[PDB]
């Protein structure tokens, strides 16, 4: 029932918006395809499109369904279904293809570096496809580096956002350089004024990283089994003042990870103008306070595409 061989790819281009994937500048990856459907395609037939195995259409939301192809008027041409495992859309055809002949359709699908696939900086040959007909381009994946100010060093990104429960998750690397940090204090804040909400209840788990361990340059951990959960240690070390939590690390030599899930407030305009920040403080030689800080904010792609047909007489 797969009718891939019946599909005529007129165009297919992978772009990166230079061939550099700034995954931490929220750089997208276009795949702008066009094609022709022959009339020998009937209701219930299936053509495919697959993404590269190392991308994902949505970075921080599991809600990555494929769009559906729709004629100018709005009648549906096919409804797609995305399988994360195989990273492949399967587009089933509606009765449009029976009512209509000579059918030309365009797509444009954005995607992000799958942080589970590619935990560290590297080059990749990306391979995309439209109905089996592959195309490729080479790229390199740069991950952000931490801010350093004396001993104070930190970095962070957004990992998972839940449009349903209105929460957002941020993962913070306190002391990725495993420096000796004296009276270390780490703040998390809605930011720099406010966009989210941080208080007693905002979930903050803390993990210690042994000196032999190296963290994923993606800045997204997937497995916390293999890190010392120290969250209870920080029980008696939490100050909360004006959308700002403050953590008292004391003198440290070890890296740490913080997992912050925080409620956000929806924007009336109906876009996701969300942002959150952290900052690491350490006393320096001269007895001053050095602040390195990090702030993340959400970026949005959105697939687009339609079709068109002769009306059969």
């Amino acid at each position: 029932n797969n009718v891939n061989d019946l599909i005529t790819v007129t165009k297919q281009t992978i772009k990166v918006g230079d061939n550099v994937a700034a995954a931490h500048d929220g750089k997208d990856i276009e795949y702008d395809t066009e094609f022709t459907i022959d009339n020998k395609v009937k209701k219930g037939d299936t053509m495919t499109i697959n993404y590269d195995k190392n991308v994902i259409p949505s970075d921080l939301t599991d809600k990555n369904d494929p769009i559906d192809i729709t004629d100018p008027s709005g009648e549906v041409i096919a409804k797609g279904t995305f399988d994360k495992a195989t990273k492949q859309i399967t587009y089933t055809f509606t009765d449009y293809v029976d009512k209509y002949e000579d059918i030309k359709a365009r797509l444009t699908l954005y995607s992000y570096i799958d942080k589970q696939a590619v935990p560290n900086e590297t080059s990749l040959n990306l391979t995309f496809a439209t109905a089996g007909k592959e195309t490729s381009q080479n790229v390199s994946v740069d991950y952000q580096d931490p801010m350093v100010h004396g001993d104070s060093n930190i970095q962070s990104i957004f990992t998972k956002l839940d449009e349903n429960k209105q929460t957002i998750e941020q993962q913070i690397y306190v002391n990725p350089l495993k420096k000796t940090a004296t009276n270390t204090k780490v703040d998390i804040a809605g930011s720099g004024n406010g966009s989210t909400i941080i208080d007693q209840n905002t979930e903050m788990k803390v993990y210690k990283v042994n000196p032999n361990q190296q963290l994923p340059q993606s800045n997204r951990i997937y497995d916390f089994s293999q890190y010392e959960d120290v969250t209870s240690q920080f029980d008696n070390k939490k100050s909360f003042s004006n959308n700002v939590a403050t953590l008292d690390f004391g003198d440290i030599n070890s890296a740490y990870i913080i997992k912050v899930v925080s409620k956000y407030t929806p924007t009336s305009d109906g876009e996701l103008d969300i942002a959150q920040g952290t900052s690491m403080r350490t006393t320096d030689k001269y007895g001053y306070y050095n602040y390195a800080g990090y702030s993340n904010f959400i970026v949005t792609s959105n697939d687009t595409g339609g079709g068109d047909g002769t009306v059969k007489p």
């Binding site: 949505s58 809600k63 990555n64 900052s279 306070y289 990090y294 702030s295 993340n296 792609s301």
Partner: peptide, 17 residues
Amino acid sequence: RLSSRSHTLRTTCWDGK
């Protein structure tokens, strides 16, 4: 259809006197 960005800000804080 959704991903993050990162930004950096540094200051120092001493005592005026």
